[PDB]
Design a binder for this molecule. Structure first.
Ligand SMILES: CN1CCN(c2nc3c(c(=O)[nH]2)CCCC3)CC1
Ligand SMILES: [Zn+2]
Length: 208
């Protein structure tokens, strides 16, 4: 039941999603090993992901969380990078999309920094890079990220450099405690707490 609707570059919605993508690029501690060397992207396409059943699954769970947290879903828009982006947009997030080895346990991880999610497009640590050239810094091959609506509810705060949520919480927030420029990362433990709203197709750009 998934349909993908292309947004025009003239559409304010295209422009606001592009800006979130470009404006949350940072430098990574690996010097670009996992995700490549770049300061900005070439955005090729932004599509709205439309699935009624997956949307209703999300909103149902959002209302449950909200009623357990003084009517506050604590909903954010966050990036997700994965080799399984085609399955996510068709069947939703579920326990097959869980980072078993994540630092906050086996859940589904999201980032405020688009460049953080970019490191996972070709797999954990960037895998072996693009399928065509085996290059984690490929500037030719088209990459995809999801920009997702995520219900955090009561989030457990972890200060730091499928499982269950900590008791009494709906998610975990990984707060950076060393790299002053890094934005937060987040984990949910139920697929129904995220909806993949935008599919973004891009290339990373070689710095001049
Ligand atoms: C194969 N899995 C795909 C998604 N994945 C993933 N992890 C993270 C992020 C992400 O976008 N995808 C952003 C925060 C850091 C962790 C874990 C590995
Ligand atoms: Zn390539």
């Amino acid at each position: 039941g998934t349909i993908l609707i292309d947004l025009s570059p003239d559409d304010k919605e295209f422009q606001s999603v592009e800006e979130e993508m470009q404006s949350t690029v940072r430098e990574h501690r690996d010097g670009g090993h996992a995700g490549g060397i770049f300061n900005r992207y070439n955005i090729l396409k932004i599509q709205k992901v439309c699935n009624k059943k997956l949307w209703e699954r999300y909103t149902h769970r959002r209302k449950e969380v909200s009623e357990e947290n003084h009517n506050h879903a604590n909903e954010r828009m966050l990036f997700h990078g994965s080799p399984f982006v085609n399955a996510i947009i068709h069947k939703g997030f579920d326990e097959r999309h869980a980072y078993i080895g994540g630092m906050f346990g086996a859940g589904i991880y999201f980032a405020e920094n688009s460049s953080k999610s970019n490191q996972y497009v070709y797999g954990i640590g960037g895998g072996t890079g693009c399928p065509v050239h085996k290059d984690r810094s490929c500037y030719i091959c088209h990459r995809q990220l999801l920009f997702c609506r995520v219900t955090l509810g009561k989030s457990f705060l972890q200060f730091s450099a499928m499982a269950h949520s900590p008791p009494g919480h709906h998610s975990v927030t990984g707060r950076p405690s060393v790299n002053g420029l890094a934005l937060a990362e987040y984990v949910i433990y139920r697929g129904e707490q995220a909806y993949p709203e935008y599919l973004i197709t891009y290339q990373i750009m070689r710095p001049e």
